[PDB]
Amino acid sequence: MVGVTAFGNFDLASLAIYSFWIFLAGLIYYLQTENMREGYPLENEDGTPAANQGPFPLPKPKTFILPHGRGTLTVPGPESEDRPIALARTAVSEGFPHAPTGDPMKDGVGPASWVARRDLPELDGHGHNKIKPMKAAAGFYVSAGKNPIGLPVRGCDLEIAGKVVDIWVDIPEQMARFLEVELKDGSTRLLPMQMVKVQSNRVHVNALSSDLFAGIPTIKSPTEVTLLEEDKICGYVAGGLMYAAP
Amino acid sequence: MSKFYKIWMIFDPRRVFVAQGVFLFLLAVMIHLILLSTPSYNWLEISAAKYNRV
Amino acid sequence: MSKFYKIWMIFDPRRVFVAQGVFLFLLAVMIHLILLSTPSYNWLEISAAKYNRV
Amino acid sequence: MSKFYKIWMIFDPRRVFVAQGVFLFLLAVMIHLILLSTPSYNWLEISAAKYNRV
Amino acid sequence: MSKFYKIWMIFDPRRVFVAQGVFLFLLAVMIHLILLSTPSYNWLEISAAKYNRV
Amino acid sequence: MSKFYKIWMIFDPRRVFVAQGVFLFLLAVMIHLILLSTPSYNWLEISAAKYNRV
Amino acid sequence: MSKFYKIWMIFDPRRVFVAQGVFLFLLAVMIHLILLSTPSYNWLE
Amino acid sequence: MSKFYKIWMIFDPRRVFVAQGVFLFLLAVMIHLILLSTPSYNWLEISAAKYNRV
Amino acid sequence: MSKFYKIWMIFDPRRVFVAQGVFLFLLAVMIHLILLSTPSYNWLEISAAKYNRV
Amino acid sequence: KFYKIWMIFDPRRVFVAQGVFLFLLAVMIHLILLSTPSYNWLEISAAKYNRV
Amino acid sequence: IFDPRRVFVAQGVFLFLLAVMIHLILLSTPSYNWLEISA
Amino acid sequence: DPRRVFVAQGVFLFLLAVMIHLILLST
Amino acid sequence: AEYQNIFTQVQVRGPADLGMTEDVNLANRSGVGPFSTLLGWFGNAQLGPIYLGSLGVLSLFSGLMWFFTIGIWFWYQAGWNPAVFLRDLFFFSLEPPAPEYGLSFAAPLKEGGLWLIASFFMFVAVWSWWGRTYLRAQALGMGKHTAWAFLSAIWLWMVLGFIRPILMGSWSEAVPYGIFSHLDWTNNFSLVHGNLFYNPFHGLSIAFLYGSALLFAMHGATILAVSRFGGERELEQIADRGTAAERAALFWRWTMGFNATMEGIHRWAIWMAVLVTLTGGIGILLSGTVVDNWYVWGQNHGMAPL
Amino acid sequence: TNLRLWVAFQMMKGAGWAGGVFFGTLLLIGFFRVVGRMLPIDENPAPAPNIT
Amino acid sequence: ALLSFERKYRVPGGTLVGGNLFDFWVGPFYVGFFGVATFFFAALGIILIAWSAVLQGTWNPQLISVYPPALEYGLGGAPLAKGGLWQIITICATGAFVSWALREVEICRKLGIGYHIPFAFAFAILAYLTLVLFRPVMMGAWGYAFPYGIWTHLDWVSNTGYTYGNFHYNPAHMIAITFFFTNALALALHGALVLSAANPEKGKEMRTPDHEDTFFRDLVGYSIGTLGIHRLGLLLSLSAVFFSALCMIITGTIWFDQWVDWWQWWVKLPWWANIPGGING
Amino acid sequence: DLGYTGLTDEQAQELHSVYMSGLWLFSAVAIVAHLAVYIWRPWF
Amino acid sequence: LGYTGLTDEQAQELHSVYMSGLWLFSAVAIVAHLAVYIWRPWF
Amino acid sequence: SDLGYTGLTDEQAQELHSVYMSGLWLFSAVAIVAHLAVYIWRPWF
Amino acid sequence: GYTGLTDEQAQELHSVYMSGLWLFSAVAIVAHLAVYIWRPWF
Amino acid sequence: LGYTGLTDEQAQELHSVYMSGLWLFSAVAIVAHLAVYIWRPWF
Amino acid sequence: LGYTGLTDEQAQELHSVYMSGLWLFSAVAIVAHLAVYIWRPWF
Amino acid sequence: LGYTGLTDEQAQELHSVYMSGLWLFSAVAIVAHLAVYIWRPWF
Amino acid sequence: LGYTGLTDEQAQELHSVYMSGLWLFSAVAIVAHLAVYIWRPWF
Amino acid sequence: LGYTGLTDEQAQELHSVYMSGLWLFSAVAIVAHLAVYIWRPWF
Amino acid sequence: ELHSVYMSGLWLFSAVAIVAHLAVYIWRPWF
Ligand SMILES: COC(C)(C)C/C=C/C(C)=C/C=C/C(C)=C/C=C/C(C)=C/C=C/C=C(C)/C=C/C=C(\C)CC/C=C(\C)CCC=C(C)C
Ligand SMILES: COC(C)(C)C/C=C/C(C)=C/C=C/C(C)=C/C=C/C(C)=C/C=C/C=C(C)/C=C/C=C(\C)CC/C=C(\C)CCC=C(C)C
Ligand SMILES: CCCCCCCCCCCCO[C@@H]1O[C@H](CO)[C@@H](O[C@H]2O[C@H](CO)[C@@H](O)[C@H](O)[C@H]2O)[C@H](O)[C@H]1O
Ligand SMILES: [Fe+3]
C-alpha cells in the first residue's frame, strides 16, 4: 500500500480528489458553453442585446451538414424571429408579462406560439417524406388498439367538431402522428396524436372547443405536411389549454 | 527564440490568457498550501514560536 | 508595460470585473479564514485571552 | 477616482443593486453568526453570565 | 439622501414590496427562532422557571 | 531528423501543443510529488533537519 | 401615513386578501405548534 | 522488408502515431512503476541506502 | 500451402492487422504476466536473490 | 464432398468461428494444465532444476 | 423445412458444449482424472 | 407449422433427456 | 384526465424496416424477426434484424463459454440434481483462487482454477463487444460516443476483476461469480476497507448515479411534456429548432435559471452516466492500494468528527 | 356592508385552503400512526440510527 | 436578459394562486405565489442550518450536522438545540420542495406543456417524505429519520442498513437497484446515440433517426425508438425511486429481522427443502 | 396615479377603510385572546 | 434613469409614503426593543 | 463597445453615482458608529 | 446459392482450407508426440 | 487588434479608471498590512 | 471474386509483405526463446 | 496557419505586451524567492 | 491499397522518416538499457 | 499532403520555432538535473 | 444433397467416437 503523503495529509487519494475537482469544473464549463448555442446573446424586451451576458462566453461556432441537401446550420450564429410578435408589454420595467394584443391563438403567442421552421417536410433516411397519410402509405394498417376511423371528434365543450378520416403515420418509426379530422364544412384538419384521447366510441380533444377546429392551420398539400405547418398546428392546439377554457 | 511570437497566430489569445491565469493561481495556491502544511515553513507558526505567542 | 491597456481590446470588461470581484472576495475570505484557523492569528481569541474573557 | 461613475456605463444599476443587496445581507449575517459562534463575543451568552441568568 | 426617492425609477415597486415583505418576515422569524434556541432568552421557558411551573 | 518537420503536416499544432502541455505539467507535478513522498529527497524535510528547524 | 391606501393601486386587493388569509392562518398554526410543544403551555395535556 | 512502407497505404498516419504514442507512454510508465514497486530496483531507496540518508 | 494469399480477399486487411496487433500484444503481456506470477521465473526476484540485493 | 460447406456457409463466418473456437480451446487447455500440479511445466522445471 | 445455414451452427455449438460437459464431468470425478490418474 | 413443432419437440425431448440422466447422475 | 403519452393509443404496423445500409455488410445482417404487440404499447414493435459479424461471433461464443462455465460449476455444486440447482441458484458461486496462490495460475480447478478460465472468457466477450460497438457505429458513419461511454463501464469492470487484483497481488481480491456471493463481496469490501461510504470517489460515484436518475427523470419528463410539439424527434429539433425545444428550454430557465439545448442536454446525459463508473473505478482502485481505512482517512480530511 | 362580506370571503378563501392542506397532512400523519400501532412495531423496536 | 426566442412566451396567466400579484420574473427565474413561498422556505432552511452550525460549534461544511430529536421525545417536539431545529428545517424543506413542484406546475401551464416534470419531481418528494415523515411516524419517533449533514446522513444509511444485516438482501432494495443501474445504462446509451447521430465521423451529414434505429438493431437486435427511450428513462427513474421508498417503508415496520432470513422461504419450499447436497441442503 | 391594477383613488380609499376596520377588529379580538391567556398563564 | 416609467413626482410621492411606513415600522421596533431591554437587557 | 453597455448616458451615470455614493457614505457612517460602540463595549484589539 | 459462390470457388476455398487444416493438424500431432515423450499421460 | 469592439482610446480610458481603482485598492491593503504588521508581525 | 474489393495481384503483394514480417517477428522470437532457454530452461 | 486570424503585425505586438507582463511577473517572483531564501533557505 | 490517400511516393517519404525516428528512439533506449545493466544487471 | 494545410514552409517554420522551444526547455532541465545530481546523486 | 454429405460426417464422427469409447473401455471400463 502506498498510503504515503507528499505533504500534510495529501496522499495519492488527495491528489485524485483534487484533480477531479479541477476536471469537474472544466467539464461543467464545457457543458454549459456547449449548451449556449441556441438563444444567445441575451436580449432586452425591445430586442436589443442585453448589458449582461453571463459569466460563460459563447462557444466557437460549429457547422452541421444537413442530411438531404438541406444546407448547413452554424451555431451559435445569427438569430431572429422572422414572424412578428403580437404582444404589448404590461410594464416599463423588465420582468413582467407581455399581454396579447388580439387573439393569441390566431397570432401564435404564449402557449400558442410557433417557430418559423423550414417550410419543407421532414425526410427519412431514404429521402422520402417522414410523415404521410396512412391511406397513402403502402402496407400500413392499425395493428392494435381501437381504430379511430369514423369516430366523432368531441371538443372540451362536449360538442362534436367532426369525424376522423385518416391517420398520419411516421413511416421510419411506424407510429401514428396526426389524425386527419373532417369538419362540418368538409375541409380536413390535422390533430397531433399526443393531444387527443381515443375513447371507445369517440375521440375527445381536451385542448380545443367545437368552435375552434376551424382555426387550426391548414396544410397546403393534402398528402404532405411541413415542419412549419406541424409547428403551427401543434402550437395552436396546445394554446387552447389556456385560451380555450373560459 | 525570436520567432516565439508566432504562437499567437496558432492559439486564441483569450483562451491562452484564461488558461494561464487559472493555471498560475492554482499553482500559487498549491505551493502556498504546501508550505503551510509543512511546519518548518509555516510562516504563521514560525512567528508564533519566535514571539512566544502560543 | 506602457501597452497593458490593450488587454481591454482582448477581454470583455463586463466579464473581467465580475470574475475579478468574485476572485478578490473569495481570496480575501480564504485568507481571513486561514488566519482564524491558526490560534496565533485568531484575533477573536487573541483579544479574549488578552482581556481574560474566558 | 473622479471617473468611477463610468462603472454604471458598464454594469446595469438594477442587477448590481440586487447583487449588492444579497451580498451585503449575507455578509452581515455571516459575521453576526461568527460572533455568535465564538463564546467570547456571543452577546446573548455574555449578558446571561453578567446578570446571573443561568 | 435628499434624492433616495430615485430608487423607484430604478426598481418597480411591485417586485420591491414583495421582496421586502419576504425579507422582513424572514429576518423577524430568524431572530425569534435564534432567541428561542438560546436558553438565556427563550421567553417561554424563562416564564416556566420564573413561576416554578415545572 | 532533417525531415522531422513534416510531422506538422499530419497533426494539427493546436491539438499537439495542448496535449504536450498537459502531459508535461502532469508528469512534472507527479515527479515532484514522488520526491516529496520519499524522505530521502523531500527538500523541505532535508532543510529542516540541516537547519534544526524542528 | 394617511396615504397607505395607495397600496391597493399597486397590488390587486382580491389577490392580496387570499394570500393574506394564507399567511395569517399559517402564522397562527406555527405559533400554536410552538406553544403546543412547550410543556408549560400545552393545553391538550 | 523493403516493402514495409506499404503499411502507410493501409492505415492512417494520424491514428497510428496517436495509438503508438499512447501505447509507448503507457508501457514506459508501467515498466517504470513496476521497477519502483520492486524494492530491489527502487532507485530512490537504493540511493538512500547507499549514501545512508535515513 | 502456396495459395494462402486469397484469405486477404476474404477478410479486410485493416481490421486484420488491428486484430493481430491487439491479439499479439495481449498474448505477450499475458505470458510475461504469467512468468512474473511464477516465483521461479520472476526475473526481478531471481536477480535480487542472485546478487544479494534484498 | 465436404467442399460443399462453402457453397452454403459464408467463408468469412466459418473461418472466424473456427478460429475463435480454436484459440479459446487452446487457452482453456493450457490453463487446465497449469491448474494441475502434475502438468504445470513451470513448477515441474522449478523442482527439477532446484530453483525458487 | 429446415434452413441449411441455421441448423449446422446451432447443432455444432450443441455438440461442442456437450463434449466439454462430459470431459469436465470426468475431470470432476476422481476416478476419471487422467491428469491425476497418470500421476 | 412443422418447423415450430420440431423446435418445441426437440427442445422438450433434449432438455428432459438431459434432465432425466442428470437426475440419474445426481443419485 | 388528458392523454399523457406514456402508452400508445393506436398501434400502426407497416412493412418491416430493414435499416440503413451506409457501409454495413448486408450479408452479415439477418432478417427481421417477429413484431411484438406487447412492446408496441411502449416502444417499437419490430424485433430485429440483428447484425452478426466477426466480432459478433467472437463475443457470442466467448460469453457463452463464460456463461456455460459458471453454470456447469453451479451444476457441480448442485450434485447434478435439478431440484438442488433451482433451490440454491442464488447461493452457488465460482470463487476466485485463495490468497495463498497470489497472482499465480497454479491453482486447482475446484479452488479458483475455473474462476480464471471463466474470467478469461468474460474478458474476451466484453472487449469483443466493445469493438462491436465501435464498428457498428463506424459502419453507419456515426460518432463513436457509444463506444467511449461503454469504455467507462469497462474501466470499472476491469478495475474490479483485473486491474486491482494485479495491484493488490492476488486474484482473491476479485469478484466471485454468484448472485448472492458478489453481494457478499460488495458488503465485505466495505467492511474490510473501513466503511466505503467515506471513500470520496464512492461518494462522487453515488452523486452521479443519483444524478443520472435525476437527469433522466428530468429529460424523460421534459420530452414527454413537449412531445405534443414533436419533441421526441430530437434530431430534427437540433437541425431545425422548433417550438418544442424552446418550451423545453424555457421551462428549465424559468425554473432553474439556466437551461440546455436539444443537443447539449445529451452531453449532460452521457457525462452524468459515464462519471458513475469513471469515478467509481478510481475509488475502488484507491481502496487497499492507497487507503485501507476510509473512515480513518475521512477523519484526517474533515468529513468526520475527530 | 356587501363589500365587507367580499373582503372577509377572500381572506376566508385563503385561510380555508390553508386549513385543508394543513388538516390534510394531519389526516395523512394520523393514518400512518394508526397503521404503525396495528403492526408488530412497539414489539420489535429498532435501535437509534443516529448517535444521539 | 431574455433568450432570443423567449419574449413571445412571457404572457400572463397559467397561475394557480393569485394571477397577477406575483406573476412576474426576477431575471430568468419565474416568480409565482409558490416562487415567493419556495424562496422563503429555502432561505429560512439554509439560515437555520447555518444557525445550527454555530450551536454545534463547527464551521466545516462537511462536519455540520442537524440531528433529529432523540428517541426519548417520540413524535413530539424537541428543544431547538437538541432536535427542534431539525423539525423546523424538515418543515421548511417539505414546504420548499412542495412549493417548488407547484411552481413548476404554473410554469407548465404558462408554456402549455404537459405536467410530467412536476409529477416526476413528486416521486422524489415522496421518497424524501418516506424517510423523514412516513417511516418515523410509523416507527413512532422522529429519531429514526436521517440527520441533515453531508457525511452524518451516510452514517444513518449505514446504521439503518446494518440493523438488518446486509441490506442487499432486501428484495425491494434489489429491484430498486436494478432500475437505478439500468437507468444509468439507458442514460449513457441515449446520450451517446443522439450525440453520435448529431456528430458524425468527420465532415459528414448529420445522421437521421433511421440510423439511430439501425445502430441498436444492428447491435442488440432491438430499438425502442425516440419516444420509447424517453418513456423508458422516465419510468426507470421513477420505478427505482418507488421501490426505494417501498424497501424502506416495509423495513422496521413490517420486517424486523435480518433480510437474509427472508430468502429462506424459497429454500424451505416442501418439494426440495429436504434434499442433501448443494449449499443449503 | 401609479395605478397598476385599475383601482381609482376613491375606490382605494373606500376599500382601505373597510380593510382597516376589520384589521382593528381582528387586532382587538387578538388582544382579548392574549389577555385571556395572560391572565390564565402570564409569559413574562 | 427612467427604468420604471414613474416620473419624478410619482417617485417622490411613492417614496414619501414608503418612508412614512418605514418610520412607523421602525418606531414600533424601537418601542419593542425598549420594552425587551427593560425586561431583560442584553448589554 | 465601451461607449456604453447599459444605455446610460455619461451625465446619467454621474447622477446615479452621486446618489449611490451618498448611500455608501450613509451606510458606512452607520457601520463606523456601530463599530465604535462595539469597540468601546468589548474591544477586539 | 446462400453465399454467391459456385463450385469453381467452393473447390478452391476448400483446397486451401484443408491444406491449412493439415498443417495445423501436423504441428499439433508433433506437439502432442513431444509432450508424451516428456511426460506420458497414460 | 480587437475582440470586444472597444477602440484604442476607449481601452486607454477604461484602463486609466481601472488602474486608479487598483491603486486605491492596493493603497488600503498596504495600510491594512502595515497596521496588522505593527500590531502582530508575522516575520 | 473478393469480399473486400481487392484484386488478386493486390492480395499477392499484401500477403508476401505480411509473411516477410511474420518470419521477421518469428525469427526474433526464436532468438529470444533460445536466450531464455540457455539462461533458464523450462524443460 | 492563421487559425486565429491575427496578422504578423498584430501577433508580434501582442507578444511584445505579453512578454513584458511575463518579465514583470518573473521579476517579482525572483525578488520574492530571494527574500524567502535569505529569511529561511531551503537548500 | 489507397485506403488513406497516400501515394507510393508519399508513403516512401513517410516510412523513411518514421523509421528514422524509430531508430533514434531505439538507439537511446539501447544506451538506457546498457547504462542500467552496467549499473544493476537483472540477469 | 493536406491534413493540416501547412505548405512545407509553414511546417518548416513551425518546427524551427518548436524545436527552439524544445532545446531551450531541455537545456534548462539538463541544468536542473545537473544541479540536483551534484546536491545529492540518485545512483 | 444436404443429407448425403451430412451422413458422411456422422459416420466420420461416430466411427471415431466408437474408437474413443472403445479405447477408454479398455483403459477404464465403466460397467
Ligand atoms: C471569513 O472572513 C470574514 C467574513 C470573517 C472576514 C472577511 C470579510 C470580508 C472579505 C469583507 C468584505 C467586505 C466588502 C467587500 C464590503 C463591501 C461593501 C460595500 C461596497 C458596500 C456598499 C454599499 C453601498 C450602498 C449601501 C449604497 C446604497 C445606495 C443607495 C441606497 C442610493 C439609491 C441609489 C439610487 C437612488 C440610484 C440613483 C437613481 C437614479 C434614477 C438617478
Ligand atoms: C507538486 O509539485 C510542486 C508544486 C511542488 C513543484 C512543481 C512545480 C511545477 C510543475 C511548476 C510549473 C511551473 C510553470 C510551468 C510555470 C509557468 C509559468 C508561466 C508561463 C508564467 C507566465 C506568466 C505570464 C504573464 C503573467 C503575462 C502577463 C501578461 C500581461 C499582464 C500583459 C497582457 C497582454 C496584453 C495586454 C496584450 C495586448 C496586446 C495587443 C496587441 C492586444
Ligand atoms: C479545489 C481544487 C483545486 C484547488 C487548487 C489546487 C490546490 C492543490 C493543493 C490542495 C491540497 C492542499 O490543501 C490542504 O492540504 C493539507 C494537507 O494536510 C491539509 O492539511 C491540514 O488539515 C489537516 C486536517 O485537519 C491536518 O491534518 C494538517 O495538519 C493541516 O495542515 C489542509 O486541510 C488542506 O487545506
Ligand atoms: Fe433525448
Author numbering:
A (entry chain H): 1 to 246
B (entry chain K), C (entry chain I), D (entry chain F), E (entry chain D), F (entry chain O), H (entry chain Q), ...: 1 to 54
G (entry chain A): 1 to 45
J (entry chain V): 3 to 54
K (entry chain Y): 10 to 48
L (entry chain 1): 12 to 38
M (entry chain M): 1 to 306
N (entry chain X): 17 to 68
Question: Please, what does the article write about this entry?
Answer:
Rhodobacter sphaeroides is a model organism in bacterial photosynthesis, and its light-harvesting-reaction center (LH1–RC) complex contains both dimeric and monomeric forms. The core light-harvesting (LH1) system of Rba. sphaeroides is characterized by the coexistence of dimeric and monomeric forms corresponding to the S- and C-shaped structures, respectively, observed in native membranes. In addition to PufX, a previously unrecognized integral membrane protein, referred to as protein-U, was identified in the core complex. Protein-U is located opposite PufX on the LH1-ring opening and has a U-shaped conformation.
In order to further explore structure–function relationships of protein-U, we also determined the cryo-EM structure of a monomeric LH1–RC from a protein-U deletion strain of Rba. sphaeroides IL106 (strain ΔU) at 2.63 Å resolution. The ΔU LH1–RC monomer revealed a half-moon-shaped structure containing 11 α- and 10 β-polypeptides. Three αβ-pairs near where protein-U resides in the wild-type LH1–RC monomer as well as the β-polypeptide paring with the 11th α-polypeptide were not identified in the density map. In addition, a group-B spheroidene between the 9th and 10th β-polypeptides was also not observed. By contrast, all other proteins and pigments in the ΔU LH1–RC were present and had the same structures as those in the wild-type monomeric LH1–RC6. This result clearly indicates that protein-U plays a critical role in controlling the number of αβ-subunits in an LH1 monomer and that a structurally complete LH1 ring is a prerequisite for both LH1–RC dimer formation and its subsequent stabilization, in firm agreement with biochemical analyses. Another important finding of our work concerns the role of protein-U. Although protein-U has no inter-monomeric interactions in the Rba. sphaeroides dimeric LH1–RC, it clearly plays a role in regulating LH1-ring size. Because monomeric ΔU LH1–RC complex lacks protein-U and only has a half-LH1 ring, it could not form a stable dimer.
